[PDB]
Amino acid sequence: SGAIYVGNYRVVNRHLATHNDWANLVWEDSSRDLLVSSTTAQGCDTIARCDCQTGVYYCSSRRKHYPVSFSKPSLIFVEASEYYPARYQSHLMLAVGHSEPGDCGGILRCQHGVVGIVSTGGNGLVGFADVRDLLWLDEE
Ligand SMILES: O=c1ccncn1CCO
Ligand SMILES: [Zn+2]
Numbered sequence: 001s002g003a004i005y006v007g008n009y010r011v012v013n014r015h016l017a018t019h020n021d022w023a024n025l026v027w028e029d030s031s032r033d034l035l036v037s038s039t040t041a042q043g044c045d046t047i048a049r050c051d052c053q054t055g056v057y058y059c060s061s062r063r064k065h066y067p068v069s070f071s072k073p074s075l076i077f078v079e080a081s082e083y084y085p086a087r088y089q090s091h092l093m094l095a096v097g098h099s100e101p102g103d104c105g106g107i108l109r110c111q112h113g114v115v116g117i118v119s120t121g122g123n124g125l126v127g128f129a130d131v132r133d134l135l136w137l138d139e140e
Pocket of ligand 2: 048049050051052110111112113
């Protein structure tokens with residue numbers, strides 16, 4: 001589990017979105033595993049605006065933050081998980097690291113702020129859904 005709290009937006013994995021999230025929907029994309037909903041209180045996170053390929057992510061299944069190198073956001077084939085079939089996922093970044101299904105929502109951050117959230121795992125890789133292209137998260 002995990003979210004990004006930027007302004008009056010809550011960014012979650014689409015597959016973990018709650019009824020309250022869908023009842024307050026701003027934007028969702030199944031191909032990216034992302035959903036954004038509205039919040040009453042302002043959030044403590046800043047979104048990275050950059051093309052960094054090094055950062056640190058939080059891994060709940062280890063209680064640890066790991067420094068990683070990661071690929072630029074791509075369209076990637078993902079094998080079946082407990083929450084999705086084998087499919088193509090867009091705006092995905094891969095690193096070598098530990099990721100189980102419950103690690104989804106862990107933040108990846110660089111020197112500029114929050115890059116994305118854990119979205120995929122297995123075979124010794126961790127995939128992150130990028131949010132740095134979502135410039136509208138910073139305004140209105
Ligand atoms: O801090 C750690 C590290 C590894 N396993 C457990 N704990 C306790 C709280 O979950
Ligand atoms: Zn950066």
